[PDB]
Amino acid sequence: VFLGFLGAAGSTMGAASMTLTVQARNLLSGLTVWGIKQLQARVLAVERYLRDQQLLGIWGCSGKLICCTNVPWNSSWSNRNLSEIWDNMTWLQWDKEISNYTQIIYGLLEESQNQQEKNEQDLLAL
Amino acid sequence: QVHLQESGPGLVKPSETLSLTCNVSGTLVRDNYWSWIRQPLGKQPEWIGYVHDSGDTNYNPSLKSRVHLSLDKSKNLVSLRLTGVTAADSAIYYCATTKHGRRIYGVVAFKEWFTYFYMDVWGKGTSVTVSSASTKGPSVFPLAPSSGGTAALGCLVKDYFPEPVTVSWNSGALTSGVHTFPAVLQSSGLYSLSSVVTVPSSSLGTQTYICNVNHKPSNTKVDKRVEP
Amino acid sequence: QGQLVQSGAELKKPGASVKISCKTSGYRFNFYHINWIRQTAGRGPEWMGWISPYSGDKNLAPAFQDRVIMTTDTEVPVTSFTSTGAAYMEIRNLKFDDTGTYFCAKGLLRDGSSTWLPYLWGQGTLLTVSSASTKGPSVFPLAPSSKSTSGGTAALGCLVKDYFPEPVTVSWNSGALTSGVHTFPAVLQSSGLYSLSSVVTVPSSSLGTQTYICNVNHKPSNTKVDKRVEPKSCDKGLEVLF
Amino acid sequence: TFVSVAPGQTARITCGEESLGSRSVIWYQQRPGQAPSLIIYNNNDRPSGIPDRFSGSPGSTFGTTATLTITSVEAGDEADYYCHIWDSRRPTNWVFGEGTTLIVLSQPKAAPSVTLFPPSSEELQANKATLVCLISDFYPGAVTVAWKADSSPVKAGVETTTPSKQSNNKYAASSYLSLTPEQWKSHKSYSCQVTHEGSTVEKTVAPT
Amino acid sequence: AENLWVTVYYGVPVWKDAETTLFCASDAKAETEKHNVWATHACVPTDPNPQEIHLENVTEEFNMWKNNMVEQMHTDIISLWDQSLKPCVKLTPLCVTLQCTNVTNNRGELKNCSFNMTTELRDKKQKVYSLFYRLDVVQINEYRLINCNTSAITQACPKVSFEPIPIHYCAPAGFAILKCKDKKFNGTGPCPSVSTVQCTHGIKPVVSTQLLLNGSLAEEEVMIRSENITNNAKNILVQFNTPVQINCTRPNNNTRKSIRIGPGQAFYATGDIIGDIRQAHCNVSKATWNETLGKVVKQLRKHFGNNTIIRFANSSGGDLEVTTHSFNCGGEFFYCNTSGLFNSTWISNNDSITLPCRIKQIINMWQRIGQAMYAPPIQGVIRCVSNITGLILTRDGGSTNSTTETFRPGGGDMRDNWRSELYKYKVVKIEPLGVAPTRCKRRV
Amino acid sequence: SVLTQSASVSGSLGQSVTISCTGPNSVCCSHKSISWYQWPPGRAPTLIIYEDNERAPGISPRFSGYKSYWSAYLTISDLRPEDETTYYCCSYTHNSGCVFGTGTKVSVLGQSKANPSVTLFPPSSEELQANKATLVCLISDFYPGAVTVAWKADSSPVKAGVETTTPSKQSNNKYAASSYLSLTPEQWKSHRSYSCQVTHEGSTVEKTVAPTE
Ligand SMILES: *[C@@H]1O[C@H](CO)[C@@H](O[C@@H]2O[C@H](CO)[C@@H](O[C@@H]3O[C@H](CO[C@H]4O[C@H](CO[C@H]5O[C@H](CO)[C@@H](O)[C@H](O)[C@@H]5O)[C@@H](O)[C@H](O[C@H]5O[C@H](CO)[C@@H](O)[C@H](O)[C@@H]5O[C@H]5O[C@H](CO)[C@@H](O)[C@H](O)[C@@H]5O)[C@@H]4O)[C@@H](O)[C@H](O[C@H]4O[C@H](CO)[C@@H](O)[C@H](O)[C@@H]4O[C@H]4O[C@H](CO)[C@@H](O)[C@H](O)[C@@H]4O[C@H]4O[C@H](CO)[C@@H](O)[C@H](O)[C@@H]4O)[C@@H]3O)[C@H](O)[C@H]2NC(C)=O)[C@H](O)[C@H]1NC(C)=O
Ligand SMILES: *[C@@H]1O[C@H](CO)[C@@H](O[C@@H]2O[C@H](CO)[C@@H](O[C@@H]3O[C@H](CO[C@H]4O[C@H](CO[C@H]5O[C@H](CO)[C@@H](O)[C@H](O)[C@@H]5O)[C@@H](O)[C@H](O[C@H]5O[C@H](CO)[C@@H](O)[C@H](O)[C@@H]5O)[C@@H]4O)[C@@H](O)[C@H](O[C@H]4O[C@H](CO)[C@@H](O)[C@H](O)[C@@H]4O)[C@@H]3O)[C@H](O)[C@H]2NC(C)=O)[C@H](O)[C@H]1NC(C)=O
Ligand SMILES: *[C@@H]1O[C@H](CO)[C@@H](O[C@@H]2O[C@H](CO)[C@@H](O[C@@H]3O[C@H](CO[C@H]4O[C@H](CO)[C@@H](O)[C@H](O)[C@@H]4O)[C@@H](O)[C@H](O[C@H]4O[C@H](CO)[C@@H](O)[C@H](O)[C@@H]4O[C@H]4O[C@H](CO)[C@@H](O)[C@H](O)[C@@H]4O)[C@@H]3O)[C@H](O)[C@H]2NC(C)=O)[C@H](O)[C@H]1NC(C)=O
Ligand SMILES: *[C@@H]1O[C@H](CO)[C@@H](O[C@@H]2O[C@H](CO)[C@@H](O[C@@H]3O[C@H](CO[C@H]4O[C@H](CO)[C@@H](O)[C@H](O)[C@@H]4O)[C@@H](O)[C@H](O[C@H]4O[C@H](CO)[C@@H](O)[C@H](O)[C@@H]4O)[C@@H]3O)[C@H](O)[C@H]2NC(C)=O)[C@H](O)[C@H]1NC(C)=O
Ligand SMILES: *[C@@H]1O[C@H](CO)[C@@H](O[C@@H]2O[C@H](CO)[C@@H](O[C@@H]3O[C@H](CO)[C@@H](O)[C@H](O[C@H]4O[C@H](CO)[C@@H](O)[C@H](O)[C@@H]4O)[C@@H]3O)[C@H](O)[C@H]2NC(C)=O)[C@H](O)[C@H]1NC(C)=O
Ligand SMILES: COc1cnc(-n2cnc(C)n2)c2[nH]cc(C(=O)C(=O)N3CCN(C(=O)c4ccccc4)CC3)c12
Ligand SMILES: *[C@@H]1O[C@H](CO)[C@@H](O[C@@H]2O[C@H](CO)[C@@H](O)[C@H](O)[C@H]2NC(C)=O)[C@H](O)[C@H]1NC(C)=O
Ligand SMILES: *[C@@H]1O[C@H](CO)[C@@H](O[C@@H]2O[C@H](CO)[C@@H](O)[C@H](O)[C@H]2NC(C)=O)[C@H](O)[C@H]1NC(C)=O
Ligand SMILES: *[C@@H]1O[C@H](CO)[C@@H](O[C@@H]2O[C@H](CO)[C@@H](O)[C@H](O)[C@H]2NC(C)=O)[C@H](O)[C@H]1NC(C)=O
Ligand SMILES: *[C@@H]1O[C@H](CO)[C@@H](O[C@@H]2O[C@H](CO)[C@@H](O)[C@H](O)[C@H]2NC(C)=O)[C@H](O)[C@H]1NC(C)=O
Ligand SMILES: *[C@@H]1O[C@H](CO)[C@@H](O)[C@H](O)[C@H]1NC(C)=O
Ligand SMILES: *[C@@H]1O[C@H](CO)[C@@H](O)[C@H](O)[C@H]1NC(C)=O
Ligand SMILES: *[C@@H]1O[C@H](CO)[C@@H](O)[C@H](O)[C@H]1NC(C)=O
Ligand SMILES: *[C@@H]1O[C@H](CO)[C@@H](O)[C@H](O)[C@H]1NC(C)=O
16 A cells, blocks of 8 residues: 555565655755755755665666566575565564675675676677 | 820920920820921921831931930820921921821832822921020900991900910800901011901990910910900 | 563362463564464364454454453563563363463464464463362472492482472572483372472482582462482492492 | 912812832822811822812823822812822932912902001000001902001001911901001091002091 | 575665754744744745654664754754854944943842943044843943953844744755654653654744743653763753743833944943833742642652652752743843742642742853853833743752752753754664565576 | 374384375365474474475474375474474464364384383381371383383282373483382381382383381
């Protein structure tokens, strides 16, 4: 249904995966003391947006909300099961376990994309 | 009713001490407040100070170091003293009861109020003249009647000091037609007034008309019978 | 991944009621169901019903449709992902075939096809339905014997006798000597009283170096017994070592 | 200070300085030749015996002077009016404010009732003689006496009082002429000419 | 298949505690014209239909004593005063020897001070008088302004207003503010029922001491909050469920003398007072305060034993701004004696209460540096009606503990004023990048 | 119970073993789920398999299940001595509850023997001042769990006051038991000795105390 911004914060990851367009629609929202206070804040808002969009774009997920990659899930990243993640765990609870291996996975998603592009160019040449 | 009467010397030498007394009749001198007021001739009245039991007595800031009031509860009368008198203290001293009041304008608790007084029952008042001259006894001389159906008749008081002089007819049995006149201050320094009565022409009796004259400063009481 | 603790064992006469608690700790009490399953001598293990603390939905079995009431308290948060809760159960119209052990179990998942499935269980609260009154136990000290002459070992313990409804625990030295403890089940006599036994295997070289104190606790009778086991044995096979 | 008001109208009287705070003005009335009486205490509160015709300005106004309003003016109210200012910003005033005399108009003229008296027989034996001329019941109090020895006026020896009202339109004036026992029997007659507003009344006397 | 693959997710409900630059919100009616010292115009309008999403199943740990929204508001207000007072008139030439005298009345207090002053020209002087409260002047052996030996003084423009208007703090894009909506919460610990909001509710920047005014009311029972109850060196913030009624008035119809002290500058002095010389005061209903003090002590026994004695007393000492209930009421700054409100002693089990208040016109920056302001006088009998929703209490660290505890008011740090309204808010940042495994693989 | 399992099943060490769990169509197995549990008598059960062929968290991959259209099976590869216990199966869905089965007693064969340890205790001194007399005959560390106890009164069969408990599994993967003999204070001082016989797979052990010593 419709729950609102961050409405599925405490729901299961599978149920919170339905409200992925709700938290994304409100992610951007469109000299004097009060004038420059919000101007410095709204500049940091687009920087925070383009930072995630750049990572999303270099991973082949530019126009994607839920993309699949070709990286094997290493067992050292909390080897949970399928029905134990999407049916009995929240996104807030899940990010705490993978918090150690966040920057680790981000390094593999970029190598696969540059390799997909270079392999794709070899096919069109023939 | 409340009847207040003042009685004093009426003549005090300069740089002396004035002693007045207010004989109270009608209420007790302890259950009421008392105040004295003096008034020079042709001027505005001036407050002197109030007196009450339980040591409630305040003086005039201009006459503070000279006046001393008191209340005689055993005799039921008000007293007054004034040491070191001058020519400016010549006035008419009154005796009146005082009823206090409380005017509130602020919040009461912060003493944002003040107590005001007002006299309601005055007295007849006494005359006090300050001078270094002696008291002279007046000389009474009768005025014979002389004239239409009506006739006049009066007395005369000549050469006395100071004011005033109480004149009564038939010991108070004649209050219709009496017109006592004010005195005249001659160059010698002695007042002189008169008093006449309008009586019908059928005066011969002899009805024995007689005028009673009294002078307090000299304790002089003279009775003079008037005859045509 | 938490721990479910239930109430103590109580003795109730047939016709009355009994309230069994089930406190939780280590997980969100509202994110999992609370299932109650019993097991008696007749008809084997029998699931009774579950309840969702979040919404309050219950589902009772037709056999317990009109004589069992389940209630759950409110969640007491401790951290952002864990909390502490409590679940109760009220079964009325007790019969003789209701004597057994009752368990409360934590749910398996939150969403899916096996959300109410019991996964994490408790320790179980034993319930005995009878008309006999509570009788206090009689603890007797057991004389040590010879378990091995060439090994230098012995065996001593305490004897609990004549105790009705059975929830009995036997420790040693306030929970200090737990190595070698062998507590045997009780026996059902012809009068209605049980009786178990306890024994601990200890070497023979320990006499004035260790104090043997068995702690027998029987809550239904509100009595605790502390016996001092004599280290001096009487067996002719063990005196060869002393 | 004088303010004349026609009888039956409303009177206004100003007394004291301008108000600086909350006040409790006390008004008084002094009859000519008598003792002052209490009229209105606490700005606008009348005791027993004073009609509702008298009203004073309320002490709640900041900046205005104490005003005494007298509705229905009568000849009896012709007297002096003093006030006692009780101001919260000013110290206690032990001297009443300078009063204001109320003048009742519509009193055109009054005829003086003069009376001349010769010296007594007991005074002549004292080697003294003095003529007495009494004047009363005249309004307004403005007369000038002129003694006459036969048809010739007398200069020195004339003693005359100043007019003074007696709780009415009646004023009082007494003229005296100091003569000698030999001066009296000398001339044939003596006159007391007292002029009023436009008239001149004269009374004579002759020895026996 | 059996081997899972990494799949990136965009727009995941994941956030971590952080700090950012917050902005404001000030309704649409706050058409007041002129220009209030804060929110008039300068702030972004508020959404006509605010949105609040209740985060079901979510439990979050709040912390009102380590919040960053307090540090921002505390400094934002300070910079707002420095901004509104920059172009206003500077009163440097007002530090001249003041030949003063008592006010015209019958504890002298007010002083009628005459002095020389510069005119529009730079030659002839000006012998004009004024009327300063005794708290603003100090003699020297004639008087002088109190700030002349410490701080420079600048008069506040009379076009601005000191009235506090609601100001909503909002977070920019990518951030969110969480509101703990439980009826019993001491500001710290995990929150049961949590919700999210883009902007906080209407918070009026009221700066008061000892007594918290016009604040938010507590739910059910009166709430007690403290950073460390066992430490007597930390204040104890209180919040009332039922507000107590307070009425303040300055019964002095003052006058505004517009003196000209040069080209463009104009000093507003105090003229002659119209009416009686009455001191300012504040009233508190005895019936309501007797029930509220008894309602707070019942919550104090839940922290110092069930059977104990609680006593109330006035301030021990220190500066004036803390020992007296100081605030603003229509323009003038008050300093009310609080010895009549804390004169009680509670054990284990009919008009109003008036307070003698005083008024200062010179006020010094609480930063302790030498920058003070001259508040222009107000004309007419001022009257303000306010609520009192909380207290700022302290505890005397007696060495003989667990016997009877005495509570004394205090203040001095306006951060507690913002903590009384920011206890139910904290800043978090949304990170929509979250990877998760599933049996999904892309193409070759 | 409406769900029928296998009354008994066995398997050697290091091998596998299959357990059946069938019943009418109303409970198994079309449109029905199956779950298994390791339920030692008197202890807390442990979830093994859920949602048919899905193991529970923390369960070794030595277990495996399979549900047909009429029955479900549980395969336990590489048997362990501690697996010798009772196993129950449940039938459930997404809406209904659970319905347990009859149970399955798994006897893991190929295990090592274990001679019982018997220790007889005479009546204590505090019990002789009651006065009563009770002999405590404890049995432990014997496999399998099937022993019979016989008492004698000075080499004479006893047919009064004999009682023995059932073999119970211990924590070391072995069985235990106990037996008691109720005697009168007159027969304790009249007989020269009492014995406790324990028969186990033909080999009979016996312990004897002596009141005369
Ligand atoms: C915080 O809390 C504190 C403490 O609670 C509080 O402080 C309080 O503040 C208020 C206002 O700031 C203050 O009120 C003042 O009270 C003055 C005293 O009034 C009391 O006494 C009178 C008389 O008592 C005497 O006489 C009795 C016989 O009559 C005798 O038995 C007594 O023993 C005593 O001797 C009494 O009448 C009053 O009763 C009033 O209050 C009752 C409720 O409690 C009410 O039901 C009554 O009706 C009455 O209210 C008025 O009634 C009629 C109208 O119906 C009026 O005619 C009366 O005069 C009453 O006002 C009190 O018990 C009072 O004098 C003050 O009012 C005068 O002063 C102000 C300021 O100067 C003026 O603006 C007013 O116009 C008024 O001035 C008139 O009265 C004075 C005094 O008589 C005169 O001198 C003036 O000339 C003027 O009179 C003339 O003008 C008026 C013009 O309209 C005309 O109508 C008259 O006919 C006349 O011609 C003022 O009201 C209070 O004292 C103070 N303290 C307490 C404890 O309350 C703070 O305010 C609180 N702060 C906040 C923010 O909440
Ligand atoms: C916050 O957290 C809580 C707890 O963590 C969470 O609540 C859980 O939510 C999940 C879903 O996300 C639930 O899981 C589902 O539960 C469904 C409900 O089961 C149905 O059957 C119940 C039994 O009915 C029988 O018994 C009655 C007699 O009692 C009898 O009359 C009937 O005929 C029948 O025989 C029934 O009571 C229950 O009714 C509830 O739900 C309805 C709404 O549908 C509501 O109106 C009622 O008031 C009552 O509350 C319900 O009808 C279950 O069907 C479902 O299984 C299907 O869906 C999954 C996919 O999810 C499929 O895979 C599957 O094949 C089925 O098609 C699923 O199991 C879970 O039970 C909740 N409770 C927990 C976990 O304790 C909240 O959602 C969280 N919220 C947020 C915002 O995060
Ligand atoms: C806790 O919360 C309460 C509730 O808001 C709050 O009470 C408020 O008090 C303030 C003063 O302390 C009030 O503000 C003033 O109110 C008076 C009287 O208001 C009347 O008139 C309005 C219509 O305007 C009516 O709606 C109302 O009901 C009253 O009848 C006003 O006269 C004041 O106006 C001046 O100040 C304004 C802002 O500063 C200016 O815009 C205005 O122009 C006035 O300034 C100038 O006016 C004259 C020129 O026209 C000039 O001569 C003057 O000298 C002056 O320079 C002012 O608005 C406010 O109304 C109260 N709230 C309510 C709802 O009534 C408490 O103060 C608060 N507690 C604390 C500690 O802050
Ligand atoms: C703080 O201190 C200052 C002094 O520096 C006070 O200001 C003074 O206030 C008094 C008021 O009491 C002023 O005195 C008054 O001045 C009036 C104006 O006089 C003008 O008119 C005359 C002709 O009449 C001209 O010659 C003159 O040059 C002025 O142009 C007078 O009219 C007043 O007289 C009234 O009062 C007296 C008192 O006895 C009466 O007798 C009179 O009849 C008349 O009613 C009076 O003299 C004074 O001028 C002010 N000085 C200054 C410098 O301003 C503040 O009031 C004071 N404030 C406080 C709160 O204490
Ligand atoms: C202006 O200020 C002066 C201050 O000097 C003030 O005069 C003072 O008045 C008070 C009371 O009005 C006087 O105090 C009195 O002291 C005597 C003892 O000496 C007491 O007995 C008095 O008690 C009586 O009066 C009380 C008045 O409230 C009654 O309540 C009480 O029951 C008694 O009847 C009284 O306390 C003080 O002595 C004078 N000061 C001087 C120097 O005379 C004046 O009233 C003020 N005026 C205005 C308009 O504000
Ligand atoms: C009086 O405060 C200044 C005075 N003067 C200046 N400046 C002068 N020149 C310059 C450049 N600044 C100031 N600047 C920033 C200031 C402040 O915020 C500040 O401390 N408070 C303003 C808010 N508050 C009050 O309302 C208040 C409440 C109860 C009692 C007393 C005061 C506390 C103090 C400041
Ligand atoms: C204001 O300035 C005047 C000067 O115009 C001061 O008047 C002088 O005062 C001093 C003593 O203070 C005297 O010695 C001078 O004779 C006075 N007249 C002059 C200097 O012309 C006046 O005192 C000043 N007012 C103050 C300082 O309050
Ligand atoms: C405070 O004093 C001022 C002036 O002293 C008062 O202003 C007067 O107000 C009245 C009506 O309220 C007007 O008729 C006057 O013209 C005003 N005076 C001037 C000089 O313009 C003001 O009313 C007083 N305030 C209070 C509450 O008493
Ligand atoms: C504070 O002031 C308010 C309003 O000025 C008071 O409320 C008034 O109470 C009286 C009862 O005495 C009512 O007659 C009025 O109608 C009320 N005013 C309003 C606007 O409703 C309140 O009582 C005062 N409180 C204190 C403690 O002084
Ligand atoms: C605040 O109020 C208290 C009490 O109302 C004041 O304490 C009084 O101090 C004076 C001396 O200045 C004493 O004569 C009184 O006896 C004291 N009152 C009491 C009840 O003891 C205090 O002075 C006021 N001001 C401050 C700053 O505390
Ligand atoms: C998986 O993580 C482990 C860390 O325990 C690491 O040793 C291993 O190399 C990782 N796998 C790959 C393919 O790098
Ligand atoms: C006052 O009256 C009494 C008796 O009436 C009298 O004795 C006394 O002398 C009178 N006072 C004076 C001063 O004469
Ligand atoms: C609170 O204060 C006490 C003493 O002042 C101190 O021991 C303690 O560490 C502080 N913090 C607490 C109690 O959390
Ligand atoms: C994990 O889930 C899969 C579902 O396909 C199942 O086959 C597997 O047995 C599960 N593993 C564990 C250890 O639960």
